[PDB]
Design a protein around this ligand. Structure first.
Ligand SMILES: CC/C(=C/SC[C@H](NC(=O)CC[C@H](N)C(=O)O)C(=O)NCC(=O)O)C(=O)c1ccc(OCC(=O)NCCCCNC(=O)COc2ccc(C(=O)/C(=C/SC[C@H](NC(=O)CC[C@H](N)C(=O)O)C(=O)NCC(=O)O)CC)c(Cl)c2Cl)c(Cl)c1Cl
Lengths: 216, 217
């Protein structure tokens, strides 16, 4: 099993954490991006079209005969294999909603951090952020996990998005104990804890070299 | 009984509307009208956004009895699971997932272009990049009638919208790809689709919101 991605956190964080939790056997291919102004992508470009991928992209997962692209598709593949999915209709709906909701959240932060105008844009982001966090908080309520009593793939997505907001602005979650408690819970999982004490753990840089925030 | 909420445009509800039609679903639409520039008034929505019991209030939304769903893809999946319009084998599920997200990327690229003040300048570039993404969809589809194989599924609804709106942007974009052109025809030719397309309820334009540079009307 091989995981391909840039040498940064980005869209692979959740996948890495999931492979770890699932005691999956895998190897990473980690491409290096260059700096400004050329942002050299040589190693990736020389192999992008040589992997058998239907829609070449980063991240990618090669598992035996299956070749997958699209972060969410990759997460879902792993998830289905390890019974880490919503089961009831209601759980599936929630799963679907959150998967997409969290992608919107991811992207709002990414759009900010890659905008030349970052500093003029930040306070807006930060003023808006509590509103979204609040919805997440209220959704989660007193459940340990997003779907209920059981951990599922979306919690991996949730962790990444929420935690990185905490890294962006360390106080952002202060108004939401259940979200702080969620992060702790995630981090406290045996496997997660042990990963986190390994050299493979890759929490930063959050974004690519092209970012204005998180490029380092 | 079921209620579909969205702005009074094509946008992200096109695929949903077409799926509800195909499935002979009983539904009503709640159509919100955005105001024109420069204010782009959102009050019609905003006045009820937080009164619908939605966990994460947004457009589009689907109210189905006691299920309250937001997120376009979630809505599609919900409908699809009800009507056997999903991938079944593991391999089918993988492909469904990939395409769902791939077409979202495609959708977003076109929207980014279409809402950029630099549209004019940026268009040729989009047009130059387009056959490469379109080729990948053509390759993927191959000789299959539908994206997952011999059975129509939700992703074909997404595919239709994305591909067809590219054809609206640039009518010749699909020329090099017989299979894609045939896919379009086939989708359009589905009984319930064909009929809907002839109705006064069909809403193919405007493509985007009032704030768009292109497709605003
Ligand atoms: C780490 C940084 C990262 C780079 S990773 C490296 C890169 N890979 C890569 O990009 C892979 C991405 C892929 N998708 C994946 O794997 O996941 C790489 O190097 N690759 C190698 C090569 O060689 O290529 C990074 O920066 C990054 C980059 C890209 C992306 O994602 C790309 C993308 O396009 N993703 C799809 C969109 C996902 C997220 N969606 C959104 O954020 C919001 O979506 C939309 C918003 C508006 C909009 C419209 O204009 C329509 C308006 S509708 C009315 C509106 N409702 C909504 O907005 C609802 C949206 C919701 N999601 C839904 O679907 O329902 C409204 O009025 N609402 C009401 C209200 O009150 O709010 C127009 C009609 C549209 Cl169309 C959309 Cl889609 C990512 Cl993620 C990252 Cl991180």
């Amino acid at each position: 099993m091989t995981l391909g991605y840039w040498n940064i956190r980005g869209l692979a964080h959740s996948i890495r954490l999931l492979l770890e939790y699932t005691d999956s056997s895998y190897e990473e291919k980690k491409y290096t991006m260059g700096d400004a102004p050329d942002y050299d992508r040589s190693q990736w470009l020389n192999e992008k079209f040589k992997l058998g991928l239907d829609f070449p992209n980063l991240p990618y997962l090669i598992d035996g005969t299956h070749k997958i692209t699209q972060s969410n598709a990759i997460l879902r593949y792993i998830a289905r294999k390890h019974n880490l999915c919503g089961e009831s209709e209601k759980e599936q709906i929630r799963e679907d909603i959150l998967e997409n909701q969290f992608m919107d959240s991811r992207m709002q932060l990414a759009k900010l951090c890659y905008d030349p105008d970052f500093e003029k844009l930040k306070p807006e982001y930060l003023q808006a952020l509590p509103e979204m966090l609040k919805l997440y908080s209220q959704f989660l309520g007193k459940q340990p996990w997003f779907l209920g009593d059981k951990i599922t793939f979306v919690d991996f997505i949730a962790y990444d998005v929420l935690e990185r907001n905490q890294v962006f602005e360390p106080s952002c979650l202060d108004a939401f104990p259940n979200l702080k408690d969620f992060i702790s819970r995630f981090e406290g999982l045996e496997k997660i804890s042990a990963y986190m004490k390994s050299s493979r753990f890759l929490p930063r840089p959050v974004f690519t070299k092209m970012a204005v925030w998180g490029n380092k």
